Write a protein that binds this ligand. Structure first.
Ligand SMILES: *Cc1cc2c(nc3c(=O)[nH]c(=O)nc-3n2C[C@H](O)[C@H](O)[C@H](O)COP(=O)(O)OP(=O)(O)OC[C@H]2O[C@@H](n3cnc4c(N)ncnc43)[C@H](O)[C@@H]2O)c(*)c1C
Ligand SMILES: *[C@@H]1O[C@H](CO)[C@@H](O[C@@H]2O[C@H](CO)[C@@H](O[C@@H]3O[C@H](CO)[C@@H](O)[C@H](O)[C@@H]3O)[C@H](O)[C@H]2NC(C)=O)[C@H](O)[C@H]1NC(C)=O
Ligand SMILES: *[C@@H]1O[C@H](CO)[C@@H](O)[C@H](O)[C@H]1NC(C)=O
Ligand SMILES: [Mg+2]
Length: 502
């Protein structure tokens, strides 16, 4: 069986594969931990793949899937390995890890201003490729350079330019999807329902994206950014955050103001991240008017290329570092939760948040405003439904290093209580979420459990409608169409509709 798999792979020309090894220093273990981006799922007790396959072409990817199906393995796809819940490299059933790191080719077409992007490519590699080819082109996606396009675009992809250009998935014009039978389908082949579904319906559900075709987007040769940390007390920090929410959502689409926040007793720190599609004169004039309380000075505003701004906002030293997929910025175990809002947050919400942060220096928040282009895109244009009416995205994070692992339970408890505190102020009925911010606290499906599987649609509605709202129904239809046998599944994958043949 394990040798039948390898025999099948060899017969089909797939040669880059390594079977499980207990050797701490084996190539298997080296490849396994190479793209584990959350150390929370890195220890010895976690499930390990029986084999790791590294396909290097669309045919190798197709044949790998075909071979794996002859057996009874669970398929796991890994691009960047940034899954918050480690769903790309863990499974409660014996699984084969298909790692896509060798599928990292980016092809820029300056004549059509589009690009073909193999799904193993990271955002950083994509950004670097774009900046290299042109000074007037960029793309809208997340801020983390080591995030893989495979999972990221599959789940939407929100970033600093989303108020201008929407999500990464909102700018996909074609794609190559490899289905459960190993069929190689482009947009025309897969159909519009499936092409709709893959653009934010969540990774690991529809098949294996081989490559994305994206539209490259206009950017000025110079943009303006700032990254300013305000060190203040809770009263001022609360005033700043309460005003920020209005400034952020209301800003014109050419502007973005986001926040990173934390505390430690009396000391509160708020890192303001600013972006403007233009020069510093207009940028400073805008914030002087709308947010004079930030106390920004001329030297805070930095003019640079789009490429430089994305490296800068990511806290990288240089643009070159975008092209390093194995670069480890923060190597801490973490757990995060997210909220979307529909009504303005009361000042007391920010106050309470800051109070709880002051008691836990390992915790922090990330605040993003929607609006702009996000409110001009229809709720069903792609699976991501949180458009017009959505005000903010609020992220709560707790992170720790190896020397603090004994406080793990305490950290998680703190995060749980933070989330409970925020309940009354955020979206309700249901409490909304974001599939790229996958959260298993919401629950999960054991696909080996008959009674659960029979009621999968209703059960899955808990997280399904949080992620996709009314788009949930259409997603189920697309799923049934493209993966009726449920070859691509995980605790929160869209359920296919059953067949009476049971
Ligand atoms: C670690 C990390 C994540 C971030 C960060 N910043 C983000 C941001 O600024 N905006 C966002 O919208 N999201 C941000 N996130 C979260 C990431 O967007 C998500 O975690 C992405 O889903 C991660 O993608 P990836 O790096 O590829 O993670 P994987 O674990 O490999 O995949 C996730 C999921 O998708 C499936 N999958 C992978 N590859 C494919 C292909 N090619 N085809 C179909 N499905 C695929 C996996 O099986 C898994 O289920 C900042 C940081 C630091
Ligand atoms: C299967 O895939 C892995 C990962 O891509 C392959 O490992 C890679 O092999 C290449 C050589 O073909 C390595 O290139 C060079 O490595 C040396 C190491 O000292 C370095 O000096 C060079 O600058 C260059 O990096 C590459 O490092 C390596 N990548 C990783 C992540 O290990 C492997 O070759 C493939 N296996 C088979 C059988 O094809
Ligand atoms: C199936 O899932 C249900 C609900 O989670 C659980 O109560 C039950 O023990 C499971 N049954 C089996 C056979 O594992
Ligand atoms: Mg050894």
């Amino acid at each position: 069986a394990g040798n039948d798999l390898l025999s099948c792979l060899t017969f089909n020309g797939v040669r880059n594969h390594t079977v499980f090894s207990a050797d701490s220093d084996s190539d298997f273990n080296r490849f396994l931990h190479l793209s584990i981006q959350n150390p929370l799922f890195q220890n010895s007790l976690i499930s390990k793949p029986s084999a790791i396959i590294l396909p290097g072409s669309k045919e190798e990817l197709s044949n790998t899937i075909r071979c794996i199906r002859k057996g009874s393995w669970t398929i796991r796809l890994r691009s960047g390995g940034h899954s918050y819940e480690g769903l790309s490299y863990t499974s409660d059933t014996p699984f084969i890890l298909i790692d896509l790191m060798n599928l990292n080719r980016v092809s820029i077409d300056l004549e059509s201003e589009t690009a073909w992007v193999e799904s193993g490519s990271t955002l950083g590699e994509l950004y670097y490729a774009i900046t290299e080819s042109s000074s007037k082109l960029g793309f809208t996606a997340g801020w983390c350079p080591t995030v893989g396009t495979g999972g990221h675009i599959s789940g939407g992809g929100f970033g600093m330019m989303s108020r201008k250009y929407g999500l990464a998935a909102d700018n996909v014009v074609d794609a190559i999807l490899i289905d459960a039978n190993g069929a190689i389908l482009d947009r025309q082949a897969m159909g519009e329902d499936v092409f709709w579904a893959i653009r934010g319906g969540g990774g690991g559900v529809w098949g294996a994206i081989y490559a994305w075709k994206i539209k490259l987007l206009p950017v000025p040769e110079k943009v303006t950014v700032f990254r300013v940390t305000k060190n203040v007390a809770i009263d001022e920090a609360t005033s700043l955050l309460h005003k920020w929410q209005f400034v952020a959502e209301e800003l014109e689409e050419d502007f973005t103001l986001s926040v990173l926040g934390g505390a430690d007793e009396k000391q509160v720190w708020l890192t303001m991240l600013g972006f403007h599609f233009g020069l510093k004169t207009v940028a400073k004039s805008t914030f002087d008017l709308l947010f004079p309380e930030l106390g920004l000075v001329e030297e805070d505003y930095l003019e640079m290329s789009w490429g430089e701004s994305f490296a800068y906002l990511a806290g990288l030293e240089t643009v070159s570092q975008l092209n390093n997929r194995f670069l480890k910025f923060d190597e801490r175990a973490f757990k995060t939760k997210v909220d979307l809002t529909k009504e303005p947050l009361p000042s007391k919400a920010f106050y309470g948040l800051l109070e709880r942060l002051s008691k836990e220096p390992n915790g922090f928040i990330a605040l993003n405003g929607f609006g702009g282009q996000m409110s001009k895109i229809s709720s069903d244009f792609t699976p991501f439904p949180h458009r017009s009416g959505t005000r903010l995205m609020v992220e709560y994070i707790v992170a720790w290093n190896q020397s603090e692992q004994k406080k793990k339970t305490e950290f998680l408890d703190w995060l749980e209580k933070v989330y409970e505190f925020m309940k009354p102020f955020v979206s309700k009925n249901p409490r909304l979420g974001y599939v790229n911010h996958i959260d298993l606290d919401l629950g999960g499906i054991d696909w080996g459990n008959k009674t659960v599987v029979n009621n999968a649609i209703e059960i899955s509605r808990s997280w399904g409608e949080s992620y996709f709202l009314s788009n949930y129904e259409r997603l189920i239809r697309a799923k049934t169409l493209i993966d009726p046998n449920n070859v691509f599944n995980h605790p929160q994958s869209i359920p296919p509709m059953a067949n009476f043949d049971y």
